[PDB]
Structure formats: structure tokens, C-alpha cells
Assembly symmetry: D2
Homo-oligomer: 290 residues x 4
């Protein structure tokens, strides 16, 4: 479980009220599984097994009750509280101890990636010795995000957190890879005009040093919107349509743990049975008939 | 004085694992509010204001922080734990002291009704002096529910829980009205068919006494299925389609309390003020204007 | 004594939906399991109207006629007339003059989809009104798209404006209208608006101004499904699918309504189903003869 | 010069009655464009510009009415009728003249493919000099399709058309690529157990010659189902959720021709004119901007 990642799963939850009044947004379903399974799955697909989950004072213990130490899936999971949703970059101040002196990835708890050859897409980022990697994705509402501006060739030259005058239609996704300098940069940030510690500031620091890779995530990939009540419906439908057409599950941690050898046949079987009244447990057991 | 209702909102949620490993089914979002808002709504539209909410040990506290004592919306809410999901009929045993010598309605925490004239459809039931009333609804999969059989003249002649060979296509819905006899009937129920104290055995006792009304819920009403992950997507999409077209909400308790005179403008406004930062409050606040 | 004749206006440019509607007429598009026009047709039937005139474009009108025929298979009588250009809703009544004759009329738009409990009882006063006109008001969130009716402190209709910039309310006028025999001449006496369209809203205002306009409230318990955009099309189809799959019934099945209302008998239905017995629609037709 | 392909857009469409009673299935919308736009886009993306569209006596003239000779898209489109749906392989018998001595692809008119690097997966199959390529895709209901049987090493070893007992969950999709040998093989076919002249039989012949590439289409690709009223809606929601998140269209032919250099900026603006009053024209127009 040598390689490291962080899932930032807290947040004010204000926008979705009152759905999020007694439930962390990141415990909400997306079709047939809790939302956090998706980003967890992404980290696992990047070959990352040592993972810190950050959420609220109220909700962190809920994530721990759900997933425990992660050993049942061949992972090492730990937990820590963010007292207040002070910014994406706080991930790294809170995860200081967890990070030690290693590389680290950060994925937002509500980011849902899907599409062919993702693991390979992430491959260079995971293998990069120094610097950082982020991914850029074309959307119709860039204002909402960190916006990456491109050269008359395809070279990134500027980032902006939520620009009134977006300079491109490319948003930076909520998946990030860093070397070990990120902790110190985070520790040096002052909040922004939005009153947040902005991961955009960190990315610009790496950019200004000429150490930022910005990889393009083409239109062939889905990077699902999860901001509104309506977008949540759409994210679930999308997953449902994939799974029911293929007879396969998207971002199922037990399967991914199995396929990658984190856990064996006897393990899957044991995880499958309590879940076997429905399709989820039956799908997992059947995977095992090898 | 206040009429009395129970919302049974626990269960184990096996059928929805692993979603329900994480969160109470009756806290899953149905578009823009928790599921329990829809059944609460329903009791309210019937004029029932003194409501007991029964959930699990782990979940009750969470329904408590979500809803509070109800005074804010002009209701009186109280709570009780059901240690084990030993059947719908146990609601009356748990609620025996709440109920006293009064009539009581039972609505399932997962029952979503929508349609024109719902309060009229429930009026006879609310005002029945002796006996019980249930509602029948035509489904394509009768075998999953309690099923009511009629004779050629439309008389309820039989009621069978999850029959092998359904005698009709009419299911019994999750809304029930009882006189004060139901408490003693419950206390005598026997773990018949499957480990739970069944609502159909209660109902079967009223039928045999000639005291069960079966009101027909026509096809113009919607009774949203929350049974599977796919049906929960549909419930949500169904509500969203109504609301987005109308610019109005379905089963917004605060709205309803206001339209019925449970609370007045000033209360609505006092509710909205702290919520105006989000779309829900914005909706509350416009209420008090048009 | 008059009867009430029916008109379905299923014309229009269709530009908003290009190029879907370069291949297919909007009102032939599927709403889940049947052509869109089946809905508003079904609405007339539920109101008891069996004699119906369908108006559509020159290009599209023969397609509707391939689909529906003369209506007799469902105990209806359907006729067809062409609207050369989408010059306005109220032209429907100029085009249908020879059809309406001296009777009462009901016009429903080809893309209007109504669903909910006691719909027919909602239309009843309108159907039985002897003189004047009846429209239906529905609270929407984008009133600027429709004719908007303004109500006074007492809830009394007080004005109507077409696609106004500053709506005086959130109540739209529904795409289903009921009229006595006065409407044809009113329509023939209309001058086109600034935007160049013979407006039905100007007809309703006239009736309004005469004191002969009933405006009936279609409550939030009813659904009035949007078909203006591709995205509202998928939602209409998803809305119907969810109803139909939960119930094992069908929304707006002309055959069924004809049967239930006595327009045709069990044998006619079986005669309809046989040829169709290998598809799911036929299977439904046939099961309703059974039990 | 121009590479060739066939779109087989026939069949009764009987199981969709009455939706298909006065419309060809393959003219039904999927979200914002007719169904046939999809597989047409597929061939385009494969570098195939000379295309034969096959359909029924009644529907063929409707396709020719919508698309014309395709030169407004920088293509060559022609048409031919299939009197009766007596087999997919009939495509090559009806298209013998149009094929001549060249390679030919075939795509089914109701097939919708999407995903990251799809053009690359198609370009390998077009590159191929001798033999044939099909694609295998994991699905829920294989018995509806041609089914592939694999080794313990994962080598494709056998094929069966709609097996009662499927040997795997891997179906053959409706996209195929052949060298010029496919026409003689189709001319030698005899009707199978079912009514029909099977493409599966030709594929088996290539497989047994050691000349069939069975290209695996990973679970990251979508291959949407158009077989029921419900699958259509599903395929439309999928497409719509993708386009509205990205502000980009899926399988817009005019866009593909432009991006691939089939047509220039001027020809795009001309295409935009008749569509200019809606989002679809605007999208084409905006691409000649920025
Ligand atoms: C701003 C912020 C967001 N979040 C989470 C909530 C979402 O998963 C994600 C994005 O937040 P928003 O969605 O930008 O509030 O990050 C935190 O956990 N802590 C923070 O300080
Ligand atoms: C270039 C282009 C690709 N596509 C589709 C084809 C493939 O399904 C997908 C390829 O995306 P990709 O760059 O991420 O591989 O996008 C279009 O629909 N329109 C276009 O103009
Ligand atoms: C059986 C049972 C269900 N419930 C709630 C959850 C279910 O959605 C609903 C009906 O349960 P059911 O699955 O047996 O029909 O009632 C309880 O709160 N306690 C119970 O003992
Ligand atoms: C009788 C009948 C009604 N309807 C519709 C009209 C209304 O929208 C709704 C009325 O349902 P209701 O029985 O609850 O009043 O059902 C059909 O779609 N098919 C039918 O066969
Ligand atoms: C203006 C007009 C609209 N229509 C149809 C097209 C639309 O479906 C509907 C509403 O038109 P608008 O809504 O006035 O464009 O009525 C015609 O059939 N004829 C007409 O002259
Ligand atoms: C009175 C009231 C009803 N409702 C719901 C209950 C019904 O299912 C629906 C139909 O109303 P109608 O009976 O006015 O059509 O509206 C609210 O959501 N809020 C309210 O204030
Ligand atoms: C058998 C056959 C199918 N088709 C079309 C109809 C369907 O869209 C598709 C697949 O049909 P299938 O499952 O029966 O093979 O091919 C033809 O156009 N011609 C034919 O000869
Ligand atoms: C191995 C594995 C992949 N995936 C996902 C990750 C990517 O989104 C996509 C990659 O598919 P691919 O095989 O076509 O490249 O599939 C799962 O959801 N579960 C799994 O067990």
C-alpha cells in the first residue's frame, strides 16, 4: 500500500440543502453505490492503496464506519477531520503527517471519472519524478472552475480560479498529482478573495516554475457533473445505463481490488455473501468462478 | 385534539446495499429533499399534525437532527427506536403510549404519493369512526405487495401478502388509517410467514370483521417505487420533471404548513432567512411574497 | 342543440428541433411508446369528442393520415386539412370553417400532453358550456413563453397577454381550448400581430372582454409535459415510461380509451390486436379483452 | 481513393409498433439528431467517405430525401433497397456492384458507438490489408447477438449466432470491416437455422482461415442499445448528458467532416444557414469562429 492519495470529502453542503442536512454529499448514492466509491476507485486504478479520507467532524466517523481500515479490500485507509471547509488546498495541511515525504495524489470526493484507458491516462502523472500533473476537460461552463489558458500552440500559460471572463473552455478536474513540495506550498497559502485556500494557487506555483504537466482528458471521457440535484440524477442515470447494458459494474472497489490482486478469491467470496441478496453480491461472487 | 400519525422509517435496507450500508433509505434524496419529506407531507395534507417517527438506533438521532421537534413547522414530532426490523405492525406496539385511546394513521417512510386531489382522496379515511382504510393501486408486479381481491361487484373479499398467484393486480399502498383497535390487534400478532409482524395480518383482521375500506387510488395518481436503485432514479427524475416545469415543489413541508395555516408568513420568513443563501430558502422566501 | 367538434393543430415550422424534425414531424416523435399526437388525440376522446379534424403542414399532413386513417378502427371520424404556413394558432378556425359548421369546437395543440386524476371531470364544465369559451391556466416557471393570464385579488381572470416581457403572473394558458360557434367569425376578423401571426390569445381576450371567458385552474396535481426542447422531449418520454412501467397500464392508449368509453366493443379490439399479437402493444390490446 | 462502407438500416421495426408505423426507426431521434447520424459518424470517423445506405422499399427513399448525395458533407452517398430482411450478409450481395474490387465496412443503422480513442480502434481495422475485423463487447444479454467463445489464453476460438446457451458474455457489435473477399463469401451462404444469410457465418469463415481479428472493445466504451422503446430513451439521455456537460456534440456529421478536412469553413457556414435558428446551426457556426 506504498503509494499515497487523499480523498477530500467534506464541504459545506450548503448548495444541496436540505439533502445534505443529515448526510454528507459524499455518502449519497450515485445509482448503486455511495459517491465516494467512485474517486476511491480512481485512486485504486492509479495503483494507489494508502489513502487518507478527509471529511467533516460530523461525517468522518460515518466514512470510517462504512469502510474501516480498508484491509478487507487490501487497502490501508485512515481518516482525519477538516474542522471547516477552508479550501481544497487545506487537504495538504491536514494530510501533512499522512504525506510524510512522499508524493501524493488528491482526488475530490465528488469527482466521477469514467472512460476507456483511464489508468493509462493517469500513468505518466503517477510516474513523474518531480513537479505536478493536472487534467483539463472541455465543459460548457468554465466559470465554475479553475480555467487553464492555452498558447497558440497547445501550451498552458495561465490558470484562473472561477474567472468572470474565462479564457478557454477547459476546466481543471478534481484529480491532482503532486511531488513532495506541495505540503510546503499549501502551508504558505493565504486565503483568496473567496475566503478559500485555493488548489488553483498551488497549481500556478508549479506552473510558474515550469513544473506543471497539464494532460488533456478528451471528449471521449466522462467527467460527471455532481454540483446540482439535477446533475446528480444525470450522473446516476449515466452509470445505470452503462452497468445495465454491459452487465458490469463501474467503480466497484471490490472488483477492482480483485482484478488488481489486492485481494483473493476467498476474500471476495466473504465480501460478496452479505451483499448477495441483490445484484452487487451476486456479481462479485460470480467474478470469482476462476 | 391533534390527530395522530406514525412514520415507520427504519428497516435494514438489505435490498439497497451497499447504498444503505451508508445511509438510511429514508434519508436518500428524491431529487431535491430527503425521502422522509414526502410521507411527512402526506400526513400533513391529511391534517395530521402530531407525528411519531420510528427508526433504528443508529438512524433515529439523524431523523431527529433533520426534523427536530416539528414546532418550527407547526407540528409536534416525537421519536422512538425500533431495536429490530421485526415488522410494520410493531409500529403500533412501539407507539402504544403515543397513541393512547386515539385513532392513528401509519405511513411507511418510503411512500411517495403525488397527484390531483390527494386530500380529498384521504378525507373519508381520516374521518372514519370505526374500522380501517387502505388504498389499492394497480401495479404490474402485484406479487411483491399485499394484494387486494375484489368480487364482480367491487367488494374487498381477500387480502394476501406476496401471494404466489396474485388474485388481482391491485397492491395495498404504504398509507393506512386505523381506529383504536389496531393497538390490541398488534399485540396479538404472530410471526406468520417471514420473521416480521405484518400489516397484512392487521388488515386481514379488519376485512374479516367487515370493517376494512379499500379506497381505489386511480391511475392519474403516482405512487413512486423506491424498491430498487433503478426505481429510485425514476422517483427522483419524476419529481424533478414536475418541479422544473411548474417552478413549484412537491411535498415541501414548509410550504404545506403555510398553505394550511399551521404557521404564518413571519414564521416562513424566519425559516428562510438563514437559508436564502441556497435555492431552497429562496423558494421559501418567495412563498411569502407569490 | 349543437355538438362539439374537435381540432388538433399539429403544424408548425419545427425549426427549434432541426434536424430531428427534418426527418420526422414533431408530432410523430415518440413519447416513450407511441407517437406524440396520440396524447392530445386521447385528450379529445376523453372529453367525449369523436369527430376530429387534424391540421398539419403540406408535407406532414399525409404522414398523419398514414398513421391514423379515418379513425373508424377506434370508432372515431378523422378528417384532414392543410395549413400552408404556420401563420397562427387562430388560423385553425379559418381552416376548419367548413368542418365546424354551426357547432361548438375544441382545439388541442398537437404537442400538448396532459396527465392526471379526474382529467375528464376537469374538462366537464367546459364541455357542457353552452355559450362563451373555456381555457385552462397552469402555473409554470417560464410564463414568458406562453399566453399569460392575470388574476385579481379575488382570483378572477382580468387580462391575457401573449409572450409578454414582464409577465403579470406565472399562470400559462394551456394548449387546449373550448369555444362556442362564435370563434370562426372572430378568427376571420383578426388582423395579424406585429410579429405577423393570427393570435389565439387575441381571440381569448375578445371573449374575455365580453365576459364570456371561463378560465379554469389546472392544479399542480396535474402534469402538463413540456415538448419545446429535445431535453424536455426526453423528460416527457421518461415521465410516461415511469408511470407505465410501475402500473402495467398505458397512458393515453386510443384503443383502450375507445374500448372503455364504449366507442368500440370487445370484438373490434380483438380484431385490432390479432395482427399485432407479436408486439408488446398488441399484447396489451389483447389482454384488455380478457379480464 | 475514397474508402467504402455500408449502412444497413432496414428491418421491419415491428417490435416498436406503433412508433414505427409511420416513421423509419433509423430516422427516430437520439437526443438532438436522427439515429442514422450515429453510425454515419462512425464510418466518417474511420476515414470512410463513399457510403451505400440500405433499407426497405418504403424507407429507403426517406433516407435519400434527408441526406441526398451527401456531397454537402464532403461524402458520396448512394442507395439500394433490401426487399426483405433475410440477413445481415445480404448487405454484401445487394452491394456487390457498389463494392467492386475494394475493401468495405459495414455498420448497422441502429448502432451507436462512443468513447475515448475510438477512431484509433477503428483505424487499425481500416489499416488491415487482408482479412476482417469485428469487435467484441461485454453485455448483459449476449443471446441477442453473435457470441464469441474464447481460450484460456483469451484467444477467440468460436462464434455462434443468438445461442440459446451463450458461451460468453461477449457479443459481436454491429460494426465490421472486410477485405474484398466478403462478397464471394456472402454469395455462397445458405440460410441458417434461423431464417437467414448470417454475417456470423462469414465471420466464422474468416476466423477459421486464421484471418479474423476479434478486437476487444473495453468496458470504457459505450455501445448503446436501441432495441426497445426504453433503450432509445436511455440512449437519448446518455447522449444529452454528455453534450450538455461538455458543450460539445456527439456524432455531429457536419462537425466530423469539418474537423477531418472533408469540407472547409465556407461549406460549414453554408450548412449552418438552414439550421441557424437553433442551437444546432449555432454550434456549427461557432466552430468556424473559435
Ligand atoms: C472547499 C472544500 C470542498 N470540499 C469538498 C466538497 C466536494 O467534494 C469538493 C468540492 O467542493 P465544492 O464542491 O467546491 O464545495 O471538495 C471539502 O471537502 N473541503 C473544502 O474546504
Ligand atoms: C473529433 C470528434 C470526435 N467525436 C467522438 C468520436 C469518439 O467517440 C470520441 C473520441 O474522443 P477522444 O478524443 O477522447 O478519443 O469523440 C465526435 O463525436 N465528434 C468529433 O468532431
Ligand atoms: C419491515 C420494516 C420496514 N421499515 C420501513 C422500511 C421499508 O422501506 C418499509 C417497508 O418494509 P418492507 O421492506 O418489509 O416492506 O418500512 C421499518 O422502519 N421497520 C420495519 O420493521
Ligand atoms: C380510462 C383512461 C384514462 N386515462 C388517463 C386520463 C387521465 O390522465 C388519467 C385519469 O386517471 P384517474 O382514473 O385517476 O382519474 O388517466 C388513460 O390514459 N387511459 C385510460 O384508459
Ligand atoms: C403559429 C403556429 C403554431 N403551430 C403549432 C406549432 C407548435 O407546436 C405550436 C405552438 O406554436 P407557437 O407555440 O405559437 O410556435 O403550434 C401551428 O401548428 N400552426 C401555427 O400557425
Ligand atoms: C396544498 C398543497 C398540495 N401539495 C401537493 C399534494 C398533491 O399531490 C398536489 C396536487 O394539487 P391539486 O390537488 O392542487 O392539483 O400538490 C403541495 O405539494 N403543497 C401544497 O401546499
Ligand atoms: C436480418 C436483418 C436485420 N436488419 C437490421 C434490423 C436491425 O436494426 C439490425 C439487427 O437485427 P437482428 O438482431 O435481427 O440481426 O439489422 C436489416 O436491416 N436487414 C436484415 O436483413
Ligand atoms: C478494471 C476496472 C476498470 N474500470 C473502469 C475504469 C475506466 O473508467 C474504464 C477503463 O476501461 P477500458 O478497459 O476500456 O480501458 O473502466 C472499472 O470501473 N472497474 C474495473 O474493475
Amino acid at each position: 500500500k506504498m503509494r499515497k492519495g487523499i480523498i477530500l470529502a467534506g464541504g459545506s453542503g450548503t448548495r444541496l440543502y436540505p439533502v445534505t442536512m443529515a448526510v454528507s454529499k459524499q455518502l449519497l448514492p450515485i445509482y448503486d453505490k455511495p459517491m465516494i466509491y467512485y474517486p476511491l476507485s480512481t485512486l485504486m486504478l492509479a495503483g494507489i492503496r494508502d489513502i487518507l479520507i478527509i471529511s467533516t467532524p460530523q461525517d468522518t466517523p460515518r466514512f470510517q464506519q462504512l469502510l474501516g481500515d480498508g484491509s478487507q479490500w487490501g487497502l490501508n485507509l485512515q481518516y482525519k477531520v477538516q474542522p471547516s471547509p477552508d479550501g481544497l488546498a487545506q487537504a495538504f495541511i491536514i494530510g501533512e503527517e499522512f504525506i510524510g515525504a512522499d508524493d501524493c495524489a488528491l482526488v475530490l470526493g465528488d469527482n466521477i471519472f469514467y472512460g476507456h484507458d483511464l489508468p493509462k491516462l493517469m500513468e505518466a502523472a503517477v510516474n513523474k519524478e518531480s513537479g505536478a500533473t493536472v487534467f483539463a476537460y472541455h465543459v460548457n461552463d468554465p466559470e465554475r472552475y479553475g480555467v487553464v489558458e492555452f498558447d497558440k500552440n497547445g501550451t498552458a500559460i495561465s490558470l484562473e480560479e472561477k474567472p468572470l471572463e474565462p479564457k478557454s473552455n477547459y476546466a481543471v478536474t478534481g484529480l491532482y498529482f503532486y511531488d513532495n513540495d506541495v505540503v510546503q506550498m499549501a502551508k504558505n497559502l493565504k486565503p483568496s478573495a473567496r475566503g478559500e485556500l485555493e488548489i488553483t494557487d498551488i497549481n500556478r506555483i508549479y506552473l510558474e516554475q515550469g513544473r506543471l504537466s497539464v494532460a488533456l482528458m478528451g471528449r471521449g471521457y466522462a467527467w460527471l457533473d455532481t454540483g446540482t440535484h439535477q446533475s446528480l440524477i444525470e450522473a446516476s442515470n449515466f452509470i445505470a445505463t452503462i452497468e445495465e447494458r454491459q452487465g458490469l459494474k463501474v467503480s466497484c472497489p471490490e472488483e477492482i481490488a480483485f482484478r488488481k490482486g489486492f485481494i483473493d478469491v476467498e476474500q471476495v467470496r466473504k465480501l460478496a455473501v452479505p451483499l448477495i441478496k441483490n445484484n452487487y453480491g451476486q456479481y462479485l461472487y460470480k467474478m470469482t468462478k476462476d
